[model samples]
Each structure stands twice: as structure tokens, then as C-alpha cells.
Target chain A: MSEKIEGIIDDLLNVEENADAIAIIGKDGQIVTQTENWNVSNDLEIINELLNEKLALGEKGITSLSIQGIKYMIVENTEERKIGTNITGKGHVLICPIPIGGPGALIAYVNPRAGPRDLLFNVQEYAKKLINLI
Target chain B: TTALVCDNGSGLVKAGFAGDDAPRAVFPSIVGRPRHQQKDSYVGDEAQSKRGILTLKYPIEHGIITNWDDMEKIWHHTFYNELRVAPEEHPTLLTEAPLNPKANREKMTQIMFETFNVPAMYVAIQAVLSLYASGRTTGIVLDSGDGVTHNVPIYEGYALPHAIMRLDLAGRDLTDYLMKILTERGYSFVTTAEREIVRDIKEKLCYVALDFENEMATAASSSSLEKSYELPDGQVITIGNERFRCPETLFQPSFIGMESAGIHETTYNSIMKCDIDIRKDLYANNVMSGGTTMYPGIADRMQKEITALAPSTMKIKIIAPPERKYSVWIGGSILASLSTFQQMWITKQEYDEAGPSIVHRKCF
Candidate 1:
């Protein structure tokens, strides 16, 4: 990955800044890398296959999939984090982040207000340019 | 040949005959989901009539085909059979977004030409219909549909590409704004159930008054039953404390002051973007169509604001249909009936052998 991509990944680790986890995935749904302190399920095969099916269908394309399907899908949980409206609770985030620069890059599925500004296009463009570069 | 005219607007998809009395059928471009899997799949009203049984969703979201399965069901199950037209025999005049994606365009054409077995197809833009309806060969067509407000300049049925301007603000934003205001005033719209009610209430009572803010203030100050409305299912509610009487949102998007342009101001901006010479023609024959055009005083207000915004030398006139909602479909119907339309249509033989690419190339 280029320095720009690494910088974006670095920026994503600041979840305290309300940033969400970013994942680097291949066209076949292989997880090349991910952000810190966030555990991801080893289910890229299903996700990649599903994405490919959508692409091949020629009818619909999935931009981002929701919990069920939304930018913010939440279920209130209050046991993990400590104090000060900590009762607001933490929730599970399940996302299959896909690269938009046109395959073999990364997508960051974010929590509410936890996404990077301009990351949508930045990551997408980065992957596209990276494809040409490599 | 029977041309199946499809009016794909921001809100409804009305399709039928070229010169029919009204569209044979009008679908909301919407769909719904069943509350439980065991329950029957809800379609349109059945999907939306009962809460939890359905959730309202547009087959085309943000003005492009999004959920194909849902949309395909709408066109096939609800629209095709209801219209009582066979794709095998009839040619189609379909509506597409001004900023339609190539992929979506290709996909839609394929669906109609190959899947639905459409004999011939012609894709037209919403702006074209509005202009055709206005009877203006030269003027601007201001269309504010479900989620978009589009300003398109038309010259002889085709739009000037550089002159097209789309504002993100539209019906969805208005509904959301209204929902917020209603919620703040102790009205609830948290579920799909309440959302429908709110939408109905908006259509029935909301409008665009020239002096919207002042009217809202006056209406808010009222303490009578005049402010009260009966829900569709017989729930009576009174409006005692009105922050503003609905329509005021147009002028004041900030609700008070946030520097956002009102629809009139936006229209003014759009007009200003046009060329100097064309501006004269645009002013002289302004066409306002689509669901939002039906709002009372919208044309009147547009005339007023546009006059103020345009050069004093330029004269302005706003032409519209008797029933604003039907204008685009009507124009499309008119387009279908014309011999000039034959140039736009792709024959069945070509469609069959060549498939969607032929439809895509020829339809547009």
C-alpha cells in the first residue's frame, strides 16, 4: 500500500476520534489487513461471493450493506465500557468492507458518525490509482 | 402500435397509453417488506397499508434503480398486469433520470427489451416531459420530485446538458423536516406505520405559499378548530401550538436562518446559470411540473421570485398543467403519439437479436 493509504489507516485507528475500523480486502474477499483493536470474523469468502453475485447479476450493486442493511444498525448494550453515560452501551459492528477504487483495496464500514470525511471516494480512488501503479 | 408510456418521476411511476384519459396505473416507485417470513409478501398498498406487514421503499432510491428485485416486482406484478399490456406486442416509452448511470440505463433497457420482451423502447428524461407539457419549445422545466429538485432547460423537446442543475433538497428532505417538526411538537413518526400517516398529512395539508413564513405565523397564532385535521383512519387531532404552518419550510430551510436557499431562490440560481440570451426565453416561458408543482401559489411564487432574480428587461411566465401530477405523463403520452417518436424506437427484431445494447443505444 502507498503512504497515503497507510496514513488513512493510521487515521482510522483513532476510534476515540469516533473513527470506525477499516479493512483491506481483495476481490476474492481475502482480508489483507485491518485497523487496530478491532476483531473481524473470517467470513470474507461468503461476502466476496455475495458481492460478485451482485456484480454479475447486472441489476443491482451493493454500495454498503447494513447490520440488517443501514448506515447505522444498532442494538443497545451497556456491559463493556465504563462510566459517564457509559450506560449508553457498546454495540456489535458487522461489516464486509469492500474496496471501491475498483477491487483489491479496502472499505471501512463505520458506526454512526464514526466514518472518515471523504474516505468514501479517497479509499475508492486510492485503490484505483494503486491498481495502475502496481 | 400501442406504446407503453412510462413516467418515471421522483415520486410515482405512471404508465399507460399515449393518449389515454389517465395513466392506466401509477405506482409509488415504492415497495415494502413482510413483518414475518411466514406472512405473505406485501406489494404496494398491501405492503404499506398495514404497519410491520410492510415497510415503504422506493425501487429507485436517489433517482436510480437501487433495489432491482423489489422494483422488478413492482413493474412486473403490479404494473404490467394492471396495465393489461403484453410486452411482446407493445413498444415502450420509458422515463429515465437526467443524471442516470450508464449501468442502470443498460440494465433497465435489458429488463424491458429482453426480460419483459418489449418490442421497442424509447427512453426520455423527466425534464423533457415537463417541457412538452408546458407546450414550450424554449424554457426551463423545474421538477421537484421525491428526493430531488431538478432545473432543466428544454429546447425543442431536448434538454441543454450544461444548463441542468440538481439540488439535493427535495420531498424526502421536506418530509424529514416535517417529521422532525412534528416530533418536536409531540407527534410520533418513529415507525413505518407513522411514516405513512405523516406522508399523507403532508400531501393533504402542506403547500408552498408565496408568503409562507407569514402565513405560518398567522396559522400558528390561530386558536380554532381550523388547524385541526382528521387522520385517514379517523383519529382527530388539533393544532394548538404551531411553530409554523408546514409550507413555511420552503422559504426557511434553516427553519429560522441557516443560509440555505428556498426553492424560489434555488430556481433563481438555476435561471442565473443559463446563458444571457436563453435567459430571456427561459423567463418568458417557465414550466413547473411534477408533484411539488401542484402546491398552491408555487407557480405564483416562482413567478414573483424569478422576476426579481431575472434581469428587469426579461419578462417571465410560468405555464403548468391543470393537474400538475399528470402533466409529465401527459407529455410522455403526447410524445408517444408523434411520428417523430418512431426515430427513437428500436424494433422488436433488432431488440431480440442485439439484446440490451441495442435498446440502450436507440432508446436514448
Candidate 2:
């Protein structure tokens, strides 16, 4: 009963192809849940700081992130369009700004070589299902 | 242990000796360093002046201490530089947000007694102090500051924990809304540095509308609401509907797309959560504190909106003294000065015995 979201996070991380890292972060920049990868988790902190600085400067969140020397750009899939419009970036890492019933983002990590559209579609679906949990 | 009263508010640090009517030093709760340089950091008003070039770092965000390293510097600067006092001699009176975590309290207590070596200390809830500052033991405290707004119903000095309501709407959001309106009106002042000027514009020009829709309806008919404000660059900007429309967000939060009952409704909701016996008392002595509540006609607007949901028989009153801008510090100042409050402070002897847990026992 208690680890429902953790299981959900695990499914999302390994289920998709080329899945590197994924996490949920609250608006206050605290990590909600994430895959237990040291580098991916450590780099998540950088996203939090960068997004905050970007938001303060009246900039539209981050379009790309460089974590552990790997870079990922924000990509859009069709499913997120319904709730996709709410948040674009400042997600720190993937920062697509999906509503998690609060001002948090469903952060996903993708290396530059991997295509994220298929993963993003599932990301939005997972975000939708997890909305009430937060 | 001068009994210095320090209210480490999210926006400002209101610090002064107990019994003082006002804080001796009222400044920004921010530490800044030059954008290009790594050293020579500035604190408080010093940082305020060089804000344009300074890469600012707020030690506290939304009433919680985020950067403990910067926070320690802020405290050190406030004690040694700003007030120019010896911390060991002063029994510091500190105020914390109502929902402040116990871990943060203990950390602060440890810092005060160990590092600062304050002879004694008393940690207090900001809302409770505001209630005392207003001279009311039983009432509803509506404190709105830069980061957040709180509705705490107090009975005989103890806050009803369950009844405490919090709204993440306050001066900063209202100021940002005004900045948005200015951009919409073709006056684009969009720089983080320019935010200070916009905030000043909000404080000087913005006001609450008695009737939200009614004011806008008449705003078109009456052009008398316009006022000219000159900027530092000598650009004269005429403000009109932006004045009332900005603050209207308090009554109608959807203006900013924040989904919640407005501040007035939250106050009413907080009252309903309390004991039925104290509902009338909560309504009757509505005390206000923090900088955001200082807007002109806010009390009248607050009363009007809250009364819409209230019964005619319910006696609702709002006490908003001009000193509410620093009510938490003022209350601490006044309380710490009283001879009776001397015993209330957890002395170093007591701290040596019980450790940080003694704060929870003595502060309430």
C-alpha cells in the first residue's frame, strides 16, 4: 500500500527502451521518487537549481539539460497535449510540467542518442494516473 | 541574556530590543554577491542597493530556511553588523512560521546556544506573536507576507493546529501580477532587478476593491482612479485599473490560475475548523500582520468578503494597526521586555540540562 508510487516509478524506468533515469520532483525542488541510480540522482539536483534560476529571470524553463555530460532536449508527444500545455520546462530535468495534483514535474532522463517521443507518451499517461497520489 | 527580538520573516528581518515599538533594523532577508565575483558578499540593505549586479541567494524561501550556510551569515550579520550587539548578552526572541518543521527549530536552537552562545532564547510561532501584538488572546490571525498567507485561529494564546489555514498567495504573487498587467498594457519592465521597482509600485499604487466586479464596472465610467508614477529613469507611467485589479487576486485566486478558495473563504474555512464555541471570538477579533495586509482598504475588503459567508448575527471585526507591518517582531519585543517574560526564556542552564527539546516545552 505504501510503495505504490515507487512501483509505478520502477515500471516507468525499466519498461521503456533506452530508459536512463526518471524521477518526480515537488515544486519546492525536493525529489519525490526516483530510480536508485547514483549519477542520475546526483545530477537531478543540478536541474532543480538551473530551473529555479531560469524561472526567476523570466525565461521559459530549460529546453535542454546537461547531466553527467549527457544532454537531453525537451520533446513533445501527442498524449501530453491535453495536459501538456500547463508546464513546459523548469521541470529541472525533463520538466514537461505535468500536473501531479501539485506544482511538480514528472522528470525523465534521456541520453541524446535515444528517441524520447514513445517514452514521453507513456510519461504523460503515467503522470495522469499518478495525479491523485501527490 | 538584552533580550533581542528577531522576527526572521521570509522577506524581512525585523530585529530590535524587547519593548520597542518598531524594529531598529528592517531589511531584506537576502544575501547577495556580485554576478562576476565569488567573494565580497553583501547582506540586507547593502545587498538591496547592488541588486542589479548582485547574484542574489535567499537564505529562506516561503518561511523555511533553505540555504543554511547563507542563513547563518544572515543571522551573524543581523546580530554583529546590523544591530551591532553581542549575542551572548541578549536572550534572543525568535519567531518561526506556524508550520515550521521541528527539525528546523532544533537546528536554530542549536545554532543560537552553541554557535551564537545566546544566554537564553524563546522560539515562537509568528501567528501567535501577531495575535499577542494585536492585544487579543482569542482571535483569528490573518498574516500575509512576501511568500505566503496564513489564517490561524488562536484561543487563549494557543493556536488551534488543525484550524490553521495556509494560502500560497501573498505580496510577491500580487507584485508579479502587476508586472504581468504592465506588460499587457505595453509597459514592459521585465527584469529580475526591476522587480523591486514594481513591488514599490504595488505598495504605493495598488489597493483592494470593495466590490471586485463593481469596481471594474465603475472603473471604465470613472477615470479618477489614474495616478502618475515616475520611474528612476524619469519615465512617467500612468496607473489606472491595474491598481485594484492586481489585489483582486486575493478575493479571486483564479486570476493567477491558482486553484483554491480565495483568502476570505480560507479565513472562513479556518474559523469553521475550530471549536464552535470560539467561532464568534475568532470572527470578532480578526488580527492582521505581515507586510501584505498593509494595502489600503484591505481590512474593509477582507471584512466585506468574509461577511458574505457569515451570518448577520455573527459579530465580525478586523483589527489592523499600521504597526502590523512588523507585528510579529513588535509582539516579541513587547513580550520580551515584560518582567514576567524573563522566566519564560529557556536559560543556558536549562538548555544545558534539557537540550533543544526544551524549546517545545517553554515556547508554547
Name the candidate that leads on lDDT.
2
Off by over 4 Å in 1: A1-134, B38-42, B220-226, B232-235, B240-245, B256-260, B352-355, B359-364
Count: clashes, candidate 1 = 4
Q: How well does candidate 1 reproduce the true complex, by DockQ?
A: 0.01
Query: Local error of candidate 2 at B249, Å?
Result: 0.9
Candidate 2 chain A, run of 10 with poorest lDDT: A82-91
Q: For model 1 chain B, where is the 10-residue window of minimal lDDT?
A: B238-247
Worst 10 residues of 2 chain B by lDDT: B272-281
Error of 2 at B32 (Å): 1.2
Chain B TM-score per candidate, please: 0.88, 0.97
For candidate 1, the per-residue lDDT at A29 reads 52
- Tens-digit lDDT track for model 2 on A61-97? 3334555555443222121321111112212234444
For candidate 2, list the clashing residue pairs, or say none.
A91-A95, B1-B91, B19-B333
DockQ of each: 0.01, 0.01
Fraction of native Cα contacts kept in each candidate?
0.00, 0.00
RMSD (CA, Å), candidate 2 to true, equals: 18.1
